[model samples]
Target: LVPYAQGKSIHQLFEEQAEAFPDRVAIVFENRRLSYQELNRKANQLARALLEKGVQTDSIVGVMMEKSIENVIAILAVLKAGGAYVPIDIEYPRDRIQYILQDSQTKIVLTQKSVSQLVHDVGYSGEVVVLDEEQLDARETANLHQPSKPTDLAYVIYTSGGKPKGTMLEHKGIANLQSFFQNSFGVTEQDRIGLFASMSFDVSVWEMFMALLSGASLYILSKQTIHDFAAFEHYLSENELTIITLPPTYLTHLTPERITSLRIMITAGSASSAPLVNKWKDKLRYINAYGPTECLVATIWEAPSNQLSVQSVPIGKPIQNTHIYIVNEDLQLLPTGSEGELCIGGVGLARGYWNRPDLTAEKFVDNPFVPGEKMYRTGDLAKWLTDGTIEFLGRI
Candidate 1:
């Protein structure tokens, strides 16, 4: 824990843990395993390779690949090189890929050999680095030297897809989340989490760093598991996953037979109804997260184990280091039980959008409640429920 808070970049935190626990398992994928030292070394090697080809700070690179070992390495490598990774899931349509690449103005893309052809099919003229088993096997010197700062851009995740919404997250935005997760939930290296969420989704933002920042292992949930909740349950029980963040839509299909080994569970993205909360009310610590992709992962949480059966589904209070303001049409702070748009402030908010200055300005506005502070207009309608906790009805 001594070096956990010392690092600025996410890569630095991993490196510190790797230095302390070189031989310990840093990541595991089915039969494959990578130690902290090896993962850090490989990330450094990839960073060096990228830097040699001129990848610099604030550079946006596309990552079109499946949820495999290569995808994990490529993201970390880009972070180490002081660049933001714009992930485009390989299954996405060709036109969608083309739009994202052109919109983000990505210069480099890291993909698997199978998915590399999509880049050309989408008319991308940038460099494409394909990593295979042979490359993953090769060992190299770890670059201990710092490259990116906490203020640099880490990744730009595109979410709520229909309207082409993309949220750009700086290194500090992610670091704030890492701190909140560690402090709020006590996520540590001993945990082996399930990487079930897509990189395009905000939940993945938390799922990835919550483990990587602590040197804990993350098992990329298989495509089959992601598609079928029953299969995901099987994967969870078989692997004994500790920390998880799944949407309520998927959780409804999952039963106790699937995941009895999990120690901590988090639900977000969409609303988790009262009945859904009642199902697992007595099992474990169930947290209902409320926030949009623009405000990172989540700002408010509902821990209703005891009062879960109540009529109202409380969205809970804000997480550590974050605050929520229930404001009216005039942007004035609302009294308790008053409903309006939920504005979020603090470090968890994403920096802005990619190449959409006008759109960014529309949502990320200056906070009148806090002098010089900025707040994200979540578009979520909520009202205080007299207990100081907010009750979420739905989003606008």
Candidate 2:
């Protein structure tokens, strides 16, 4: 493991990279490329605008936009202005979107023209700043100089199962994940990553900051680019993306030869296919990852060079600063190979459900093994393999 840079927030680290690589391209979208300096300058401008509307550390800024350069800028801007971002999916139903806005108690909304209209229709009386329509002068582009601590809330991502619940994530957890990925994956400025996941997905957290913080370039895919398989495959090679995180469903579509430019491919969010690994193990590195919205990433499995052994791919070990405990109903640690609920502990744990203490208390309970520590009781049933790797057994 590499030496961790302790006590730095995500925006703090990003500020360093922007200054270090001012002229380097930070993002690429539909025939548009933005340099680190340009991205930072624009984000600063938006941050200033948000602050003008009474945005502060206690404010939750609602961001509703399609995946684009503006979307990235809005998130960074909100954080810079000392406000936690609340991402509202543009494609969601109006009522659902309104529910999130009302539930989150958003102080201001950063959106496009049409989306701003929707916000108003939803009866949101808060401030609205339209990204495309708003014009910024030279003074507004100046840095706000608002500092954020690692303990401060960074963003709130909502999870929808029976009813949607917002999960609050802190800057410290994000900073830890950044360090782990940079050290484990050896991410560098030369890497180009694909941004395919929706802003609503927790994986998108890695997709956005993981690249920017590493001085790598992030390519935001359009709706058409993702929906069409051929276009999706073409874009991967054409842009020469070095790393990609996708589900097993998307992994089966492309051959190794077609995406030879890819150095690493992570199949996450579901059960991985062993056959898929056999096909690409020799060509490139394949990783099977597992985690919930509560914890961004719990465990990851790297494919061995020599294959053809196990029927199912293991979920590997806990990530940096994270611990996994398989426990029975009473929260007692179960023996190896004993299937029980998977409980996750450590820095990556979310700050509990937003505005729902009742639900949060039920899901996130105090750790019996460690006093003063909390663990998220994941309903997933898993057991430790004899080799110490975790074998995912279906949900309980």
Supply the global lDDT for candidate 1: 0.77
Candidate 1 per-residue lDDT over residues 147-174, each given as its tens digit: 6677678888876546565688877666
Best by lDDT: 2
Model 1 clash count equals 0
Please report, as a residue range, the 10-residue window in candidate 1 with the lowest summed lDDT.
1-10
* lDDT score at residue 124, model 1, on the 0-100 scale: 86
Off by over 4 Å in 1: 1-7, 133-140, 160-163, 300-302
Give the number of the best model, judged by TM-score.
2
Residue lDDT tens for model 2, 47-120: 88777888877477899887889999999988888889988987888889888988998878888976777777
Clashing pairs for predicted structure model 1, backbone only:
none
For all predicted structures, in order, the TM-scores are 0.93, 0.96
